[model samples]
Target: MNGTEGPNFYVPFSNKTGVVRSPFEAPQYYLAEPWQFSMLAAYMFLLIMLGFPINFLTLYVTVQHKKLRTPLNYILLNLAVADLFMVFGGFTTTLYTSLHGYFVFGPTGCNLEGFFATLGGEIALWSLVVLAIERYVVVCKPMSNFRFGENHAIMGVAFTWVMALACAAPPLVGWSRYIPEGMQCSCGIDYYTPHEETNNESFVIYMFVVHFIIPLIVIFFCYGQLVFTESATTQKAEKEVTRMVIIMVIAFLICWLPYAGVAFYIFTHQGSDFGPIFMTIPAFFAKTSAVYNPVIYIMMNRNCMVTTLCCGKNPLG
Candidate 1:
């Protein structure tokens, strides 16, 4: 866990040792060393300076403007809320502890932070998936009932938050906890296996299934369907639809696929001394997703770009 320890605290993919044990309890995990502390600080600084304000502008423009408060925009607003929580509750606190080189906030803060991190991560990921579905239906099957009316969009947003709450609640409820990994603290499922319950290896698979594989399947198929359906049309509206779907697919692949792939590797191989550097790559992107979503959407939607620049004032006028 700590830099002083060997690089291979957890094997690359050992289910028993790596998957079973909380990340904090792994052989030598630490909150931060001098170098790691500095890196964490720099990362947080970038997030706050560039990412936070962009997301805030996004929220303001979508929420304050009556014209921007469409059903789709409402979903986007919820996504922004999730990202903000990650910035304030997870990234900020993690940076502070890393600076101190220890978790001075005790177990409570660790659990709360982990809960928010996990919750925020899940919400952001699934929210995008849902948004993609919305787009696919709206563009491809514009007249279908399933294309999402105002009520349906509202229900969908509510469901996303409820699911995020359910996933995040486990840490607070003692199903998971933070353990000391060297000087740093990490959060994961508890080490002790409950009676008749499956081990962490199975749990890792469960996580992969629910979090990555299933969502990817849905996203891929939905977008693929939309693409194939629209290929015959050459109108400007059809071209715009195709471009939007393409951008969504690219963003999902670029932002999330690598992290999920690395997580699978980590779950399958634990306790190998490949070192922190290998882990850091995926960890960076995984955390970066919090900031990336708003950027991607705003880039894809010119309306968002214009509104963001104009701040709270309506840009259409």
Candidate 2:
């Protein structure tokens, strides 16, 4: 122990026991303080409360009306579907772990949460990417000859899953592995706690560039083009699509940005010392991307698609 080091934070009563924990040698090292873990649980609980209704309602409302839930519209709501994936598969487990003050769900549970949550996040990211690309072509493209058909819509959403699988699945088979991140309550890419021999080096860098950087740049480019290419029109359909997608993009960025920042920081500043509290909050908040997609798209934005759906059967969304 260093002379400057001290002990305000002692290891709490852990349920994870020996499942996997801080490899770093420090007795003062703990998952988080007592109040800290509970606060995270509270935050997790609130997210569950908020996440369920918004995601469920979006799907429930969409599926409730057959007209609104058509094949063409099905892929449009793919964003909401993937959000549901995180809430069901990711948030619940993390809440359990946080409440217990450690990861209680054992080894298999860790992988389950890790894979599904990462998949959900990956799918959501690419979904946003594809949506932005489609919106760009539909309205922002100078040549109006190209049309976005039902086949195109289906394939676009399909490709989101394909790409998501490519990113989320690799850790399971080879390359990097998934382990508890951020207070051991949540499981994610081991960008933070990797094994020996530059174990996750290539994979971590791969994800930062491929899954996070490239897709975000593309979305930014597409959205920036649309914003600059100003075309005023009263066509509710195109404008609604444009407005809704841009909102989704920004709201998504807001939710995930903090968590991504933490991961990127660990990536760049490899040897920096920090506590789990700084890490867990943002990871928990990122889970709420599940909450915001539907919230911003349907419930919160009044005069958009949901308004029309409830008021009357609008031919176009």
Candidate 3:
């Protein structure tokens, strides 16, 4: 009864409420209480309020100051950009639709939001992956006695961009598809449709493994190796190294683990409806990552810490 091909396609108002949703949306889905939609928009609004400014300032300060132009800052800028796009990708259509209580952008809007957010999300994911790898090489030692250089940083950003596109673009080309998800405000990879069951299942598994599992393994391995190396070579400062490693790993886990797991959970359940609550929370949970990424970096900069506390200025400037 739901669809993707037709223009002006919309599911009829739910038996429960006046709100409309995507044509591809399941019947009996997305018709949460009026207050639920209000709270959700409030949540999205809250993220925009904090995420946009924090990520924007990170980019501005890095570019505004010549001294801050380290190789690491380049990819840090990538992270900020990636997160900024995601924060916005989930905005406008989402917050607007939720406040109005339906996806007004139709199919084209769904595709746009889906593509942009997925691209932004995947870029941020690999940026974190490349980031951990950079730390490993520098702290553990570089290959053939060379230092981490501008070329290396540039290459990593290239890898992040292309590799992210590789995963994000496939849905556009029909490896699967992106459609309305959660509140019907945001669109994401379609794990709900059974029309393309074979392809969708394979796609979800691919994303779960490639996008989530592989990053999990690489990040853990790099940080674990980093912690062991630092502890082995030094004693008094080993405590600090391990503490930062914990924060980094836990920071990633808190933001991503729940979201990735739910993609798998809904995939396994296939067409089962887990209610509006189940669907909504995980997506919002992951959106919180944008804030975490930059804040963690600020914490890592000791002088930034001092300036944040004692001085009323940005240390990078």
Candidate 4:
């Protein structure tokens, strides 16, 4: 788990004889080719450059501008924090590993990367669900006395962070350990490892269902209700919300679904000759997802764009 051959569990495939090789054996070459390294490096660079400043600006503007302190904006602020965690905590290590051709930070570094990466991702997902629910209440149940205030918003944000941390803590606690994944350039919970006990595998399946599938269901249901209840006078607002929802769902699917599917496949199928190649493609996409939220949520809107720039000029002043 600490060297060029990646985890001790990796079993390379012998191309010439079409045989499954021993776990401790090394392949003729590392899984990632030179061009693949270049591509991964470029992607990580873009994520770092675009994700960090934009998310920082987002948090600044949302906090500094009294006019922008709505419940929805608070949720957006939480989302920005999550994205920053991914960029700084996850992408930084990914960049190092990709450029150097392997993880150089050792096992503790791998655990930290997996923890922060998964925590950030889960927070973002849960934040989106909160946003959808907030919008649904305001738009679809306008006459109801129910309202989301600052205190409630703060509680929601706190809950999201706590839940994210809980989800990310299992690996650190020994349910499963973090290890370098595809290309040996990234690390995550060792989903591909076969466990003697079924609990680890059961945990993964449940984690996917609870953190991903259930949140998706909640988002879609809330949005669907909003669509049916929305009126013509609110068409502009409805359009904006719909656009945000589309971008969010699309980004989530593009960035996360492939990786999840591959993990599930590898877990059930035990292993595949093409596992390394297939896993790396989706991982790059998932890592890049960190940069999408600020672009979609803030830079895409004229008001947010102006506020972001103004806040940058006099940040937290």
Candidate 5:
């Protein structure tokens, strides 16, 4: 949802007499050059075009294929719904910030956008944690029928959304406020510092703890046990599950590490300009996690590929 800052139509055009100035200027760690804007646009376009439809297909497949509708799949379906809302809703906010230089949609849109964006992050983190628990039950505790039973899956999915809805409530309830920019307002962690203290930083840290750290700990613990147990199992199915677990862990790291790293950096060094490109990089990837999920589960996995191509008639499905 983040990209290069662009023209601010609300501001009077700057005269490029002796110094180079325009309607838009590069913010710290953000790209402002024409070429950079072009690249950002291209990628944003690709994400919208490619990311949205694929995630929808993932949901469709999960629904249409009865065999694919396991407890894990149910959680995944909800994750897909969150991602879809994130991709489409978050993109609108990004466009407003980059093009208009502030919150153009006014107060109401600001609150709504902020809530949806946070909800997207919340659902993604929690649902995956739930999925990890499912895998842990299925692979680590071989005798546990909890992972396979329809009742458990239904209850788990219900619980995940309830938590997600609750997590999304704070922002909507005005626990946070969006600061107005030139034309559009940027809604992030609150900014209260004259130099470096912003509300956005606090929100980021809160998100890191609630959305990233806690969920990550659970995922790691469960996946760690799954790996250790699966490695010891002689069954071919267990070996496959082990490999899939590793891939899932790696994929999560790839998707979230950079985003968290940069956010952590900003939280500490608030006013320091890390240059446009470096700052924009994390923003680019943070929203990208929504797009990344379906790609990993649907396009990258062999069994998923076979099932999707064959319309779920494959043996793996």
Candidate 6:
């Protein structure tokens, strides 16, 4: 669906009068209905307002405090950077398209947006998975020669970004193409494309398995093992690690599960008529997850709070 095609796409149930309209119609008539406009505007505004500052502050506070610059904090810094990418790459374009009721950026813009968005999300998930594994090594395998240290953490963060870039690159090189998806207000990997040459469905399934399911399994297994092993350690340091682990797992699941479930459902049921509505629900929730990590891991911690307020002074010291 190119922009010059004169809006040939039909929205099946766009109005209360049961009227169907093509993309050629006025923006208000089809894609940017009042309700749709309001919801998208509100969502984007909230994401920008809350997501940007919190993530930036997280990065700043972590970097400023020497005591806070541990391996785990390095992973947290990477997570914040990824979340920032997701906001600027995905949500900003979404807001722009929503305002215009169509993808105004053309195909090239579409590809970049999709690639950056997907890359950010992949990095964030993989970073958390890495964090969980590191915690597991510290708690469950304390005496093992396999040491998880700052060097390992740095390499793990680098590897996560590289893998995410590799995964996101397929669309650019023709494994699939990015295009406007539900509601015409955003673009992503063409999950609904019927073109057999693109192999869109296969890629979607593969991504689901590798990016979503596998990381989830590793996180659960690592954390589940930690719960048992952590009980054996009476050290306060071990208890603090356990607390961080619990918070990370809970926050990740709460923010990601709904979006993952909806995405999987839509992927499996591509022919369903309710795609636009169904799609918006998950997309909004997933984007909102970008703001959750900073709040959960940094803002809520008293130590971080003191560091943030004191601006490099460790109140405990």
Q: What is the lDDT of candidate 5?
A: 0.57
Worst 10 residues of 3 by lDDT: 3-12
Alpha carbon deviation, residue 145, candidate 1 (Å): 6.3
Task: Give candidate 3 misplaced runs (Cα > 4 Å).
Answer: 1-30, 142-144, 230-246, 302-317
TM-scores of the models, in the given order? 0.75, 0.80, 0.81, 0.84, 0.72, 0.83
Candidates in order have lDDT scores of 0.58, 0.67, 0.69, 0.72, 0.57, 0.69
Task: Order the numbered candidates by lDDT, best leading.
Answer: 4, 3, 6, 2, 1, 5
Number of clashes found in candidate 4: 0
Candidates in descending TM-score order? 4, 6, 3, 2, 1, 5
Runs in model 2 with CA error above 4 Å?
1-29, 69-72, 193-198, 230-241, 299-317
Residue pairs with backbone atoms closer than 3 Å in model 2 (clashes): none
Question: Residue by residue across 1-317, what tens digits does model 3's lDDT show?
Answer: 22222232322234344444344433323456778778888988988888898888777666655666677678778878877787777666677777777666767788887787888778877877777776677667757678777788889899999889988888888678777766567678877655454366678677878987898788778867765552455654544644554585686677767777776777677545455556668887777767776776777543533443454674364
5-68 per-residue lDDT for model 2 (tens digits): 1111112224345432332232223444577767877888887888777667767766655556
Q: After superposing candidate 6, which stretches have Cα over 4 Å from the reference? A: 1-32, 230-237, 299-317
Indicate whether candidate 3 or candidate 6 has the larger TM-score. Answer: 6
lDDT (Cα, tens digit) per residue for candidate 1, span 1-317: 31222221222223434332333333223322457656766866676566677677877766655677566567777867877887787777767665555566666667666777778778866676777777676567757555456777778788787866766665454343433332343333332222123234444445667765777788778867765543555566445644764564576578666656655564455433444445544555556766766665656555655754664756363
Cα lDDT of model 2 overall? 0.67
- In terms of lDDT, the best-performing candidate is 4
lDDT of 5 by residue, 7-107 (tens): 22221122232332332343321224545555655666676777788778887766666677665467667777887886678765666555434344655
Query: Backbone clash tally for model 6?
Result: 0
Q: After superposition, how far is residue 139 of candidate 2 from its true place, in Å?
A: 1.8
Clashes of 1: 22
Against the true structure, candidate 6 reaches a TM-score of 0.83
